[PDB]
Amino acid sequence: LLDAKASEHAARMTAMKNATDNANELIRTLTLSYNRARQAAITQEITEIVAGANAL
Amino acid sequence: ASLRDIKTRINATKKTSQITKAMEMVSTSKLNRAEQNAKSFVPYMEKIQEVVANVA
Amino acid sequence: KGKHVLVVYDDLSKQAAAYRELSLLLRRPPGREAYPGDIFYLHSRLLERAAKLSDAKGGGSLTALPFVETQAGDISAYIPTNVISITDGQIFLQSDLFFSGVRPAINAGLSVSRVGGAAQIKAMKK
């Protein structure tokens, strides 16, 4: 049972390591998408204001 | 999708990464303490297995 | 005349699109998302005409059930916010609930009804 507990703790430690790595990869990919999203939003805002201003 | 969806997903991933890292940091101490507990019984096991191996 | 009417408007979003078309073709100054400055005035004027008349006036009533369509769940667009602010309550339908076998797909969490409790028989209230 003692070596069983040691194996259980080691398995938890390695699994949490892997989970953290995967979470950080998801975070970087999602931020990389966030950048283009907010950039397009800014362009829409500026274009919508300026095209309305131009014609009138 | 929208900045709302992207930031919500990023926040969920952030929270999950926090939880996983906390679990890992908990598990490291458990591994070390399990090892130093397993170190304790070794002479007792050696003694009993010595006696049984003698009588074997 | 003392009767009761149930009025259903199928797409206030489409109505607002038509009014935006007219406003732009008449060269009126545009607001956010090219919508005219008085789209909220239009919708408020339309929706504030549902009422529950007093027994002095006959006791009649007229209830309205407007519909607003959202793009991929964005409830924060101009027309959705305008209509959400006006009405007494909202019922939210979601594709996540709809395809998971939960139909009708009312999200009971987000949905609200301020009048509720005075519109329910005592047995249902209990």
Side-chain angles (χ1 to χ4, degrees):
Chain A
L1 192 137
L2 294 180
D3 296 349
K5 282 282 167 190
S7 180
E8 193 206 327
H9 291 332
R12 283 176 189 291
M13 190 175 78
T14 307
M16 299 309 102
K17 278 287 210 193
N18 285 6
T20 52
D21 296 2
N22 305 339
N24 291 118
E25 277 299 314
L26 270 295
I27 284 167
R28 66 165 279 274
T29 304
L30 289 164
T31 50
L32 188 151
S33 184
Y34 167 88
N35 281 337
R36 62 178 67 115
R38 70 151 176 75
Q39 181 183 336
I42 286 163
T43 302
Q44 270 311 128
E45 184 72 26
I46 295 177
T47 292
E48 287 174 38
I49 293 167
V50 72
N54 190 69
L56 296 182
Chain B
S2 177
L3 289 177
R4 167 176 287 106
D5 307 279
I6 291 160
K7 288 290 288 284
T8 304
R9 287 183 55 73
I10 286 170
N11 289 335
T13 315
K14 279 183 173 289
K15 177 183 177 177
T16 302
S17 84
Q18 292 166 336
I19 293 164
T20 51
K21 178 62 65 181
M23 279 208 69
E24 170 201 357
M25 294 314 296
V26 169
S27 164
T28 59
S29 80
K30 316 299 274 285
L31 172 60
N32 278 338
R33 282 192 271 194
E35 284 195 339
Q36 83 195 16
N37 186 5
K39 300 290 95 175
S40 77
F41 81 90
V42 172
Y44 185 86
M45 179 63 205
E46 174 66 16
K47 165 191 168 186
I48 187 166
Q49 78 192 337
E50 167 181 22
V51 175
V52 70
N54 176 25
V55 310
Chain C
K1 294 210 294 174
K3 296 288 174 277
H4 309 280
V5 190
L6 168 61
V7 189
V8 187
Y9 311 111
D10 186 74
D11 265 331
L12 296 198
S13 45
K14 286 177 173 66
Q15 180 188 6
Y19 187 56
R20 177 177 66 183
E21 173 175 327
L22 290 171
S23 166
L24 288 177
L25 292 175
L26 286 169
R27 282 187 158 278
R28 291 185 178 188
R32 57 181 284 205
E33 306 196 310
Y35 282 101
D38 62 339
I39 192 69
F40 177 85
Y41 183 25
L42 182 155
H43 275 156
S44 303
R45 197 164 71 255
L46 168 64
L47 281 162
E48 280 278 81
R49 284 158 73 174
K52 174 66 172 90
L53 286 182
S54 54
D55 283 342
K57 303 286 295 188
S61 71
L62 190 150
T63 183
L65 299 188
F67 285 8
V68 171
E69 184 202 338
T70 56
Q71 300 296 327
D74 186 11
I75 69 176
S76 67
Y78 193 25
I79 304 301
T81 55
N82 288 334
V83 189
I84 280 167
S85 75
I86 295 161
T87 61
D88 295 300
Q90 317 90 39
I91 300 157
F92 287 92
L93 301 177
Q94 299 179 341
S95 67
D96 188 13
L97 295 178
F98 177 64
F99 285 130
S100 63
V102 187
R103 64 193 82 87
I106 297 89
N107 191 322
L110 294 201
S111 304
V112 300
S113 167
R114 292 173 206 118
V115 136
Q120 244 177 354
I121 65 160
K122 192 160 57 174
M124 181 65 88
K125 293 204 298 182
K126 288 187 180 293

mmCIF file of all heavy atoms in Angstrom, chain C residues 1-6 49-63:
data_model
loop_
_atom_site.group_PDB
_atom_site.id
_atom_site.type_symbol
_atom_site.label_atom_id
_atom_site.label_comp_id
_atom_site.label_asym_id
_atom_site.label_seq_id
_atom_site.Cartn_x
_atom_site.Cartn_y
_atom_site.Cartn_z
ATOM 1 N N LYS C 1 -63.034 47.752 -26.825
ATOM 2 C CA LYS C 1 -64.390 47.243 -26.667
ATOM 3 C C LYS C 1 -64.530 46.285 -25.492
ATOM 4 O O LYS C 1 -65.632 45.787 -25.251
ATOM 5 C CB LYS C 1 -64.840 46.548 -27.952
ATOM 6 C CG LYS C 1 -64.984 47.492 -29.124
ATOM 7 C CD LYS C 1 -66.046 47.022 -30.090
ATOM 8 C CE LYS C 1 -65.650 45.726 -30.758
ATOM 9 N NZ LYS C 1 -66.748 45.191 -31.604
ATOM 10 N N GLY C 2 -63.455 46.025 -24.757
ATOM 11 C CA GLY C 2 -63.506 45.147 -23.610
ATOM 12 C C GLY C 2 -62.989 43.746 -23.835
ATOM 13 O O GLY C 2 -63.039 42.935 -22.907
ATOM 14 N N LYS C 3 -62.490 43.438 -25.026
ATOM 15 C CA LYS C 3 -61.984 42.108 -25.322
ATOM 16 C C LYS C 3 -60.533 41.979 -24.867
ATOM 17 O O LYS C 3 -59.988 42.842 -24.177
ATOM 18 C CB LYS C 3 -62.109 41.811 -26.813
ATOM 19 C CG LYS C 3 -63.530 41.761 -27.314
ATOM 20 C CD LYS C 3 -64.233 40.517 -26.826
ATOM 21 C CE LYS C 3 -65.697 40.532 -27.214
ATOM 22 N NZ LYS C 3 -66.506 41.320 -26.245
ATOM 23 N N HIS C 4 -59.905 40.873 -25.249
ATOM 24 C CA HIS C 4 -58.504 40.610 -24.963
ATOM 25 C C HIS C 4 -57.821 40.150 -26.239
ATOM 26 O O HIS C 4 -58.335 39.283 -26.948
ATOM 27 C CB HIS C 4 -58.358 39.546 -23.881
ATOM 28 C CG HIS C 4 -59.175 39.817 -22.659
ATOM 29 N ND1 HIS C 4 -58.781 40.707 -21.684
ATOM 30 C CD2 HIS C 4 -60.372 39.330 -22.262
ATOM 31 C CE1 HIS C 4 -59.695 40.747 -20.733
ATOM 32 N NE2 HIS C 4 -60.671 39.922 -21.061
ATOM 33 N N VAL C 5 -56.657 40.725 -26.529
ATOM 34 C CA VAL C 5 -55.955 40.472 -27.779
ATOM 35 C C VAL C 5 -54.543 39.990 -27.482
ATOM 36 O O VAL C 5 -53.896 40.471 -26.547
ATOM 37 C CB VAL C 5 -55.911 41.730 -28.667
ATOM 38 C CG1 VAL C 5 -55.399 41.378 -30.044
ATOM 39 C CG2 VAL C 5 -57.283 42.359 -28.753
ATOM 40 N N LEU C 6 -54.073 39.033 -28.276
ATOM 41 C CA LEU C 6 -52.686 38.588 -28.247
ATOM 42 C C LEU C 6 -52.034 38.933 -29.579
ATOM 43 O O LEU C 6 -52.375 38.344 -30.609
ATOM 44 C CB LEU C 6 -52.600 37.088 -27.983
ATOM 45 C CG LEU C 6 -51.230 36.456 -28.224
ATOM 46 C CD1 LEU C 6 -50.191 37.071 -27.320
ATOM 47 C CD2 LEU C 6 -51.294 34.963 -28.013
ATOM 48 N N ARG C 49 -47.886 50.456 -26.344
ATOM 49 C CA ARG C 49 -49.321 50.475 -26.578
ATOM 50 C C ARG C 49 -50.019 49.195 -26.136
ATOM 51 O O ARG C 49 -51.245 49.108 -26.247
ATOM 52 C CB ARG C 49 -49.594 50.757 -28.053
ATOM 53 C CG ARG C 49 -49.390 52.218 -28.407
ATOM 54 C CD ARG C 49 -49.123 52.424 -29.879
ATOM 55 N NE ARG C 49 -50.312 52.230 -30.696
ATOM 56 C CZ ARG C 49 -50.361 52.467 -31.999
ATOM 57 N NH1 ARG C 49 -49.306 52.913 -32.657
ATOM 58 N NH2 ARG C 49 -51.495 52.244 -32.655
ATOM 59 N N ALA C 50 -49.278 48.207 -25.642
ATOM 60 C CA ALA C 50 -49.892 47.092 -24.937
ATOM 61 C C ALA C 50 -50.188 47.497 -23.499
ATOM 62 O O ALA C 50 -49.360 48.128 -22.836
ATOM 63 C CB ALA C 50 -48.970 45.876 -24.964
ATOM 64 N N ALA C 51 -51.369 47.132 -23.009
ATOM 65 C CA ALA C 51 -51.779 47.608 -21.697
ATOM 66 C C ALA C 51 -52.886 46.731 -21.138
ATOM 67 O O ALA C 51 -53.435 45.868 -21.824
ATOM 68 C CB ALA C 51 -52.243 49.065 -21.756
ATOM 69 N N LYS C 52 -53.195 46.968 -19.866
ATOM 70 C CA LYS C 52 -54.301 46.336 -19.159
ATOM 71 C C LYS C 52 -55.238 47.443 -18.693
ATOM 72 O O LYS C 52 -55.004 48.065 -17.653
ATOM 73 C CB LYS C 52 -53.785 45.508 -17.984
ATOM 74 C CG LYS C 52 -54.865 44.927 -17.093
ATOM 75 C CD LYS C 52 -55.695 43.899 -17.825
ATOM 76 C CE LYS C 52 -56.629 43.182 -16.883
ATOM 77 N NZ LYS C 52 -57.939 43.865 -16.773
ATOM 78 N N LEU C 53 -56.290 47.693 -19.464
ATOM 79 C CA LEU C 53 -57.184 48.802 -19.170
ATOM 80 C C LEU C 53 -57.936 48.576 -17.865
ATOM 81 O O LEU C 53 -58.273 47.448 -17.502
ATOM 82 C CB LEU C 53 -58.181 49.002 -20.309
ATOM 83 C CG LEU C 53 -57.619 49.641 -21.574
ATOM 84 C CD1 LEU C 53 -58.717 49.816 -22.602
ATOM 85 C CD2 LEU C 53 -56.985 50.972 -21.242
ATOM 86 N N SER C 54 -58.194 49.671 -17.161
ATOM 87 C CA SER C 54 -58.946 49.616 -15.918
ATOM 88 C C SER C 54 -60.412 49.310 -16.196
ATOM 89 O O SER C 54 -60.896 49.434 -17.322
ATOM 90 C CB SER C 54 -58.828 50.937 -15.166
ATOM 91 O OG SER C 54 -59.211 52.016 -15.994
ATOM 92 N N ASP C 55 -61.125 48.898 -15.146
ATOM 93 C CA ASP C 55 -62.541 48.591 -15.300
ATOM 94 C C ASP C 55 -63.372 49.823 -15.619
ATOM 95 O O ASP C 55 -64.508 49.685 -16.081
ATOM 96 C CB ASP C 55 -63.073 47.901 -14.047
ATOM 97 C CG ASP C 55 -62.669 46.444 -13.977
ATOM 98 O OD1 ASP C 55 -62.291 45.890 -15.030
ATOM 99 O OD2 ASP C 55 -62.731 45.851 -12.878
ATOM 100 N N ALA C 56 -62.840 51.023 -15.379
ATOM 101 C CA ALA C 56 -63.496 52.225 -15.877
ATOM 102 C C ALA C 56 -63.518 52.237 -17.399
ATOM 103 O O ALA C 56 -64.525 52.610 -18.013
ATOM 104 C CB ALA C 56 -62.790 53.470 -15.342
ATOM 105 N N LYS C 57 -62.421 51.823 -18.024
ATOM 106 C CA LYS C 57 -62.301 51.826 -19.474
ATOM 107 C C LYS C 57 -62.848 50.561 -20.117
ATOM 108 O O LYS C 57 -62.851 50.469 -21.349
ATOM 109 C CB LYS C 57 -60.835 52.010 -19.868
ATOM 110 C CG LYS C 57 -60.198 53.263 -19.300
ATOM 111 C CD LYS C 57 -60.682 54.510 -20.012
ATOM 112 C CE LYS C 57 -60.236 54.501 -21.461
ATOM 113 N NZ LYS C 57 -60.519 55.790 -22.145
ATOM 114 N N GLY C 58 -63.301 49.591 -19.330
ATOM 115 C CA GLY C 58 -63.859 48.370 -19.868
ATOM 116 C C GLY C 58 -63.157 47.101 -19.450
ATOM 117 O O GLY C 58 -63.743 46.022 -19.581
ATOM 118 N N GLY C 59 -61.932 47.191 -18.945
ATOM 119 C CA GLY C 59 -61.223 46.027 -18.469
ATOM 120 C C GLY C 59 -60.512 45.214 -19.526
ATOM 121 O O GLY C 59 -59.991 44.141 -19.206
ATOM 122 N N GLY C 60 -60.467 45.681 -20.766
ATOM 123 C CA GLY C 60 -59.783 44.945 -21.807
ATOM 124 C C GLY C 60 -58.279 44.941 -21.615
ATOM 125 O O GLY C 60 -57.719 45.648 -20.778
ATOM 126 N N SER C 61 -57.612 44.115 -22.414
ATOM 127 C CA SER C 61 -56.167 43.987 -22.335
ATOM 128 C C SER C 61 -55.612 43.662 -23.712
ATOM 129 O O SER C 61 -56.314 43.128 -24.570
ATOM 130 C CB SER C 61 -55.749 42.905 -21.336
ATOM 131 O OG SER C 61 -56.057 41.617 -21.832
ATOM 132 N N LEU C 62 -54.342 44.001 -23.913
ATOM 133 C CA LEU C 62 -53.615 43.648 -25.122
ATOM 134 C C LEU C 62 -52.185 43.315 -24.737
ATOM 135 O O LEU C 62 -51.476 44.163 -24.192
ATOM 136 C CB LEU C 62 -53.640 44.790 -26.141
ATOM 137 C CG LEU C 62 -53.121 44.526 -27.553
ATOM 138 C CD1 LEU C 62 -53.853 45.404 -28.545
ATOM 139 C CD2 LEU C 62 -51.631 44.774 -27.644
ATOM 140 N N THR C 63 -51.766 42.090 -25.019
ATOM 141 C CA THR C 63 -50.418 41.635 -24.717
ATOM 142 C C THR C 63 -49.657 41.411 -26.015
ATOM 143 O O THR C 63 -50.238 41.007 -27.026
ATOM 144 C CB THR C 63 -50.449 40.359 -23.873
ATOM 145 O OG1 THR C 63 -49.113 39.974 -23.530
ATOM 146 C CG2 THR C 63 -51.125 39.242 -24.613
#
